[PDB]
Design an enzyme around this catalytic site. Structure first.
Site, PDB file in Angstrom:
ATOM      1  N   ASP A 206     -79.783 -44.714 -70.716  1.00 14.62           N
ATOM      2  CA  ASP A 206     -80.016 -45.351 -69.406  1.00 14.62           C
ATOM      3  C   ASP A 206     -79.068 -46.548 -69.166  1.00 14.62           C
ATOM      4  OD1 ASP A 206     -81.850 -43.269 -68.822  1.00 14.62           O
ATOM      5  OD2 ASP A 206     -83.652 -44.522 -69.094  1.00 14.62           O
TER       6      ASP A 206
ATOM      7  N   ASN B 244     -85.729 -47.605 -73.748  1.00 13.70           N
ATOM      8  CA  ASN B 244     -84.350 -47.075 -73.710  1.00 13.70           C
ATOM      9  C   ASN B 244     -83.760 -46.798 -75.051  1.00 13.70           C
ATOM     10  OD1 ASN B 244     -84.307 -46.765 -70.988  1.00 13.70           O
ATOM     11  ND2 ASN B 244     -83.510 -48.811 -70.511  1.00 13.70           N
TER      12      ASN B 244
ATOM     13  N   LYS C 290     -84.431 -52.253 -74.094  1.00 12.24           N
ATOM     14  CA  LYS C 290     -85.857 -52.418 -74.282  1.00 12.24           C
ATOM     15  C   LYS C 290     -86.353 -51.097 -74.951  1.00 12.24           C
ATOM     16  CE  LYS C 290     -86.747 -50.675 -69.669  1.00 12.24           C
ATOM     17  NZ  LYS C 290     -87.564 -50.829 -68.395  1.00 12.24           N
TER      18      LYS C 290
ATOM     19  N   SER D 192     -88.563 -38.268 -64.186  1.00 12.80           N
ATOM     20  CA  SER D 192     -88.248 -38.662 -62.825  1.00 12.80           C
ATOM     21  C   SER D 192     -88.477 -40.149 -62.627  1.00 12.80           C
ATOM     22  CB  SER D 192     -89.111 -37.884 -61.849  1.00 12.80           C
ATOM     23  OG  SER D 192     -90.459 -38.188 -62.119  1.00 12.80           O
TER      24      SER D 192
ATOM     25  N   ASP E 166     -80.021 -53.409 -70.069  1.00 14.21           N
ATOM     26  CA  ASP E 166     -81.415 -52.908 -69.994  1.00 14.21           C
ATOM     27  C   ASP E 166     -81.987 -52.489 -71.346  1.00 14.21           C
ATOM     28  OD1 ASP E 166     -83.710 -52.522 -68.438  1.00 14.21           O
ATOM     29  OD2 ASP E 166     -83.094 -50.537 -67.768  1.00 14.21           O
TER      30      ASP E 166
ATOM     31  N   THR F 178     -86.549 -55.709 -66.822  1.00 15.16           N
ATOM     32  CA  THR F 178     -88.002 -55.900 -66.941  1.00 15.16           C
ATOM     33  C   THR F 178     -88.286 -57.332 -67.444  1.00 15.16           C
ATOM     34  OG1 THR F 178     -88.242 -53.580 -67.561  1.00 15.16           O
ATOM     35  CG2 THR F 178     -90.129 -55.024 -68.153  1.00 15.16           C
TER      36      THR F 178
HETATM   37 MG    MG Z   1     -85.103 -45.963 -69.237  1.00 13.59          MG
END
Ligand code: MG
Length: 301
Positions: free
Chosen positions: A155, A138, A135, A18, A133, A174
């Site tokens: 993701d 992921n 990283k 979640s 994204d 991030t």
């Molecule tokens: Mg993720």
């Protein structure tokens, strides 16, 4: 998007995850018996829920992508309150958690895993899709209990199709992992994923984060100025070829940064002669540091 009740087609079980406006449950498709993951995304105009535009962009990219190293979208459903992605069940956990269970890792063996990451990104970039994204959290494994585990990039919530005739600018991701053009609100494209691959690589070899400062402010300043070192403490067993591969990715000017295609031809990934293969064989991951790293959400704005 499918207008039927997902429960008519799937039995759903336990929560896998979640995040802010989503929950993931394991599910089993009734007509085939096969298992998937069902991600329920709350529909928003209202400061709760995901906008229609972002949901549609992410789904439109997932529907396009078909490759062994990228998560596959099975079906999409919609009701009054959610959009539900039925996704490939990616159940082997994070790559770095898996690598941290091993006693050691040569640079040769690390490039094996990195190469699958490179191949998924090579496919995305060849379709002009930036992930935006990339990283360690992921980068997952499909199934850890097989002779050769398959990496899945997941993701696609921040992914974009690159539009030749219109610059894309946004602040997201991030701080430890975002390219300088993201920190400076400059034009973004495929190059930003290449920078993040450089960061993932530097961590994979050392267990250190190249730009991390004591505060968010310092991390961003470090990223923007490209201020990092290969400290002897962490990198004394790392090859010159490794360090060159990283140096060619962690480059301020996006047009000078190595592209995905270049990356896959780099001699650290694909040695051209015996000497280069031997240099790689002689170096290894700093496993004691890397294990601490693996044993240790965060957003630009
Ligand atoms: Mg993720």
């Amino acid at each position: 998007f499918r207008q039927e009740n997902v429960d008519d087609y799937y039995d759903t079980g336990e929560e896998l995850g979640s995040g802010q406006f989503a929950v993931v449950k394991k599910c089993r498709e009734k007509s085939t018996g096969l298992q998937y993951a069902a991600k329920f995304i709350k529909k928003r105009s209202s400061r709760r829920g995901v906008s229609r535009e972002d949901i549609e962009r992410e789904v439109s990219i997932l529907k396009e992508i078909q490759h062994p190293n990228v998560i596959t979208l099975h079906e999409v459903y919609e009701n009054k309150t959610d959009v539900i992605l039925i996704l490939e069940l990616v159940a082997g956990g994070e790559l770095f958690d898996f690598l941290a269970e091993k006693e050691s890792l040569t640079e040769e063996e690390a490039t094996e895993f990195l190469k699958q990451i490179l191949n998924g990104v090579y496919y995305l970039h060849s379709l002009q899709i930036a992930h935006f994204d990339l990283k360690p959290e992921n980068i997952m494994l499909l199934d850890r209990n097989v002779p050769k585990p398959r990496i899945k990039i997941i993701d696609f919530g921040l992914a974009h199709k690159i539009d030749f005739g219109n610059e894309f600018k946004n602040i997201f991701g991030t701080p430890e992992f975002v390219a300088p053009e993201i920190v400076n609100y400059e034009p973004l494209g495929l190059e930003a994923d290449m920078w993040s691959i450089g960061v993932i690589t530097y961590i994979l070899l050392s267990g250190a984060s190249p730009f991390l400062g004591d505060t968010k402010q310092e991390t961003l300043a470090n990223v923007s100025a490209v201020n990092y070192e290969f400290e002897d403490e962490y990198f004394s067993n790392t090859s010159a070829l490794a360090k060159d591969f990283i140096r060619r990715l962690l480059v301020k000017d996006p047009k000078k940064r190595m592209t995905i295609q270049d990356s896959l031809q780099h001699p650290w990934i694909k040695p051209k002669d015996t000497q280069q293969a031997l240099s790689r064989k002689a170096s290894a991951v700093n496993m004691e540091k890397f294990k601490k790293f693996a044993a240790r959400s965060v957003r630009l704005i």
